[PDB]
Paper text:
Upon meiosis onset, Mmi1 is lured by a ribonucleoprotein (RNP) complex, composed of the nucleocytoplasmic shuttling RNA-binding protein Mei2 and the DSR-containing lncRNA meiRNA, that accumulates in a single nuclear body overlapping the meiRNA-encoding sme2 + gene. Both Mei2 and meiRNA are essential for the assembly of this structure and the completion of sexual differentiation. Interestingly, Mei2 mutants lacking the RRM3 domain (residues 592 to 750, hereafter called RRM3Mei2) failed to accumulate meiotic mRNAs, suggesting that Mei2 RNA-binding activity is required to inhibit Mmi1 function.
The RRM3Mei2–RNA complex revealed that F644 and F634 side chains form π–π stacking interactions with U7 and G8, respectively. As revealed by the PISA server, several Mei2 residues also form specific hydrogen bonds with U4 to G8, rationalizing the stronger affinity for U7GU7 than for poly-U15. U4 binding pocket is solvent exposed and hence any nucleotide may fit in it. Although mei2-F644A mRNAs were also increased by 3-fold when compared to wild-type mei2 + transcripts, these data strongly suggest that Mei2 RNA-binding activity is required for its own downregulation.
Residue numbers in the entry: 580 to 727
Write the structure that this text describes.
Amino acid sequence: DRNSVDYAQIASGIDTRTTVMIKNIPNKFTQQMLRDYIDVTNKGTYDFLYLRIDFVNKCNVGYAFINFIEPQSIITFGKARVGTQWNVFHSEKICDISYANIQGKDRLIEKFRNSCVMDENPAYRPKIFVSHGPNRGMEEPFPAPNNA
RNA sequence: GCUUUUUGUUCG
């Protein structure tokens, strides 16, 4: 209901949400393969990316999270991938998306900066990329923790 | 044939 993606509301500017859940991902798909998968259609249009990893079984958990700098980049990705199979690892999964429950790079940094997922391998951690300017799209170090 | 489905306080 609430996390349903409607491309007509993105295009009309009613729904200004930028964080999206990338659901139904092959479990042996990696952070590199996902960045590459997105970069086909949406190179430099996103400023956050997090593919959740099972640290014990050493493979993704079936979903990822991406934040688009502009909501209209959700139509570009959505129209290209939603409803399509991945063609890797004999997986019959089909790509799908929905809005994320945590919206925005600032809110996502708040959440992840003091997390124990930041203490793991960098390929297992959430990543961020410059949102605006001539450095737009370049990977940035994640803001350090601020616990007590 | 390849898997966790709204983000690890639970390490599966």
